[PDB]
Write a protein that binds this ligand. Structure first.
Ligand SMILES: Nc1ccn([C@@H]2O[C@H](COP(=O)(O)O[C@H]3[C@@H](F)[C@H](n4cnc5c(=O)[nH]c(N)nc54)O[C@@H]3CO)[C@@H](O)[C@H]2O)c(=O)n1
Length: 105
Protein backbone atom coordinates (compact mmCIF):
# COMPACT_ATOMS: atom_id res chain seq x y z
CA UNK A 1 0.00 0.00 0.00
CA UNK A 2 2.86 2.35 -0.80
CA UNK A 3 2.39 5.15 -3.37
CA UNK A 4 3.97 3.78 -6.60
CA UNK A 5 3.24 7.18 -8.05
CA UNK A 6 2.15 10.45 -6.50
CA UNK A 7 0.25 12.79 -8.89
CA UNK A 8 0.10 16.29 -7.30
CA UNK A 9 -1.37 15.17 -3.99
CA UNK A 10 -2.84 11.88 -5.21
CA UNK A 11 -1.47 8.59 -4.05
CA UNK A 12 -1.52 5.69 -6.50
CA UNK A 13 -0.77 2.23 -5.28
CA UNK A 14 0.79 -0.33 -7.63
CA UNK A 15 -2.57 -2.00 -7.82
CA UNK A 16 -4.19 1.28 -8.91
CA UNK A 17 -1.66 1.68 -11.73
CA UNK A 18 -1.95 -1.98 -12.86
CA UNK A 19 -5.74 -1.92 -12.97
CA UNK A 20 -5.68 1.32 -14.96
CA UNK A 21 -3.10 -0.02 -17.40
CA UNK A 22 -4.94 -3.33 -17.65
CA UNK A 23 -8.19 -1.54 -18.68
CA UNK A 24 -6.41 0.79 -21.10
CA UNK A 25 -4.66 -2.16 -22.71
CA UNK A 26 -7.62 -4.51 -23.08
CA UNK A 27 -9.25 -1.65 -25.02
CA UNK A 28 -6.13 -0.98 -27.06
CA UNK A 29 -5.97 -4.68 -27.90
CA UNK A 30 -9.54 -4.82 -29.22
CA UNK A 31 -9.25 -1.56 -31.13
CA UNK A 32 -11.87 0.09 -28.92
CA UNK A 33 -12.12 3.29 -27.08
CA UNK A 34 -14.18 4.71 -24.27
CA UNK A 35 -14.67 8.43 -24.72
CA UNK A 36 -11.48 8.53 -26.79
CA UNK A 37 -9.38 6.52 -24.35
CA UNK A 38 -6.90 4.94 -24.72
CA UNK A 39 -5.35 7.70 -26.81
CA UNK A 40 -1.96 7.68 -28.59
CA UNK A 41 0.41 9.83 -26.56
CA UNK A 42 3.16 11.61 -28.56
CA UNK A 43 5.52 12.33 -25.68
CA UNK A 44 5.91 15.90 -26.85
CA UNK A 45 6.81 16.67 -23.24
CA UNK A 46 10.02 14.67 -23.54
CA UNK A 47 9.62 12.09 -20.77
CA UNK A 48 12.41 9.53 -21.10
CA UNK A 49 10.22 6.56 -20.39
CA UNK A 50 11.92 3.26 -19.52
CA UNK A 51 10.00 1.23 -22.10
CA UNK A 52 9.79 1.92 -25.85
CA UNK A 53 7.01 3.66 -27.74
CA UNK A 54 4.63 4.16 -29.23
CA UNK A 55 2.77 5.02 -26.09
CA UNK A 56 -0.89 5.22 -25.20
CA UNK A 57 -2.49 7.11 -22.30
CA UNK A 58 -5.51 6.03 -20.27
CA UNK A 59 -6.99 7.95 -17.34
CA UNK A 60 -6.04 6.87 -13.86
CA UNK A 61 -8.70 8.11 -11.38
CA UNK A 62 -8.22 9.76 -7.98
CA UNK A 63 -11.22 7.83 -6.62
CA UNK A 64 -9.49 4.53 -7.57
CA UNK A 65 -12.23 3.27 -9.77
CA UNK A 66 -11.09 2.20 -13.26
CA UNK A 67 -11.99 4.73 -15.97
CA UNK A 68 -15.06 3.60 -17.93
CA UNK A 69 -16.14 6.91 -19.43
CA UNK A 70 -16.84 10.48 -18.44
CA UNK A 71 -14.46 13.13 -17.19
CA UNK A 72 -10.92 11.66 -17.36
CA UNK A 73 -9.41 14.06 -14.84
CA UNK A 74 -5.80 15.12 -14.66
CA UNK A 75 -3.90 11.85 -14.43
CA UNK A 76 -2.78 9.32 -17.01
CA UNK A 77 -1.20 5.92 -17.03
CA UNK A 78 1.23 5.55 -19.98
CA UNK A 79 1.68 2.13 -21.54
CA UNK A 80 2.87 0.64 -24.87
CA UNK A 81 1.45 -1.97 -27.27
CA UNK A 82 3.21 -4.69 -25.32
CA UNK A 83 1.26 -3.83 -22.12
CA UNK A 84 4.34 -2.45 -20.43
CA UNK A 85 4.17 0.44 -18.02
CA UNK A 86 5.98 3.59 -19.13
CA UNK A 87 4.87 5.80 -16.25
CA UNK A 88 2.14 7.97 -14.76
CA UNK A 89 1.74 11.59 -15.65
CA UNK A 90 -0.47 14.53 -14.84
CA UNK A 91 -1.84 17.89 -15.73
CA UNK A 92 -1.66 18.81 -12.03
CA UNK A 93 1.12 21.39 -11.74
CA UNK A 94 1.28 21.91 -15.54
CA UNK A 95 0.18 24.99 -17.52
CA UNK A 96 -2.67 23.62 -19.66
CA UNK A 97 -3.11 20.41 -21.60
CA UNK A 98 0.60 19.76 -20.96
CA UNK A 99 1.82 17.22 -18.43
CA UNK A 100 4.38 16.84 -15.69
CA UNK A 101 5.57 13.51 -14.35
CA UNK A 102 4.12 12.02 -11.19
CA UNK A 103 6.78 11.39 -8.58
CA UNK A 104 7.44 8.10 -6.89
CA UNK A 105 6.92 8.87 -3.18
N1 LIG B 1 -5.31 20.99 -16.44
C1 LIG B 1 -6.12 20.06 -16.99
C2 LIG B 1 -6.14 19.90 -18.35
C3 LIG B 1 -6.97 18.92 -18.89
N2 LIG B 1 -7.74 18.14 -18.04
C4 LIG B 1 -8.62 17.12 -18.70
O1 LIG B 1 -7.83 16.39 -19.66
C5 LIG B 1 -8.76 15.95 -20.63
C6 LIG B 1 -8.06 15.69 -21.98
O2 LIG B 1 -6.63 15.53 -21.72
P1 LIG B 1 -5.74 14.50 -22.48
O3 LIG B 1 -6.18 13.11 -22.32
O4 LIG B 1 -4.34 14.75 -22.04
O5 LIG B 1 -5.78 14.92 -24.01
C7 LIG B 1 -4.47 15.05 -24.69
C8 LIG B 1 -4.11 13.77 -25.38
F1 LIG B 1 -5.09 12.81 -25.59
C9 LIG B 1 -3.54 14.27 -26.70
N3 LIG B 1 -2.07 14.01 -26.82
C10 LIG B 1 -1.49 13.10 -27.67
N4 LIG B 1 -0.14 13.17 -27.50
C11 LIG B 1 0.12 14.11 -26.56
C12 LIG B 1 1.33 14.61 -26.03
O6 LIG B 1 2.50 14.29 -26.21
N5 LIG B 1 1.18 15.57 -25.05
C13 LIG B 1 0.00 16.10 -24.63
N6 LIG B 1 0.08 17.06 -23.71
N7 LIG B 1 -1.14 15.65 -25.16
C14 LIG B 1 -1.09 14.67 -26.12
O7 LIG B 1 -3.65 15.69 -26.78
C15 LIG B 1 -4.59 16.08 -25.82
C16 LIG B 1 -4.13 17.43 -25.25
O8 LIG B 1 -4.24 18.51 -26.15
C17 LIG B 1 -9.96 16.86 -20.63
O9 LIG B 1 -11.20 16.30 -20.16
C18 LIG B 1 -9.58 17.90 -19.61
O10 LIG B 1 -10.79 18.36 -18.99
C19 LIG B 1 -7.73 18.31 -16.67
O11 LIG B 1 -8.39 17.67 -15.88
N8 LIG B 1 -6.88 19.28 -16.19
Amino acid sequence: ESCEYTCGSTCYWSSDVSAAKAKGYSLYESGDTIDDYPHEYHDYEGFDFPVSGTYYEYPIMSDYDVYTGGSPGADRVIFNGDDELAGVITHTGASGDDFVACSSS
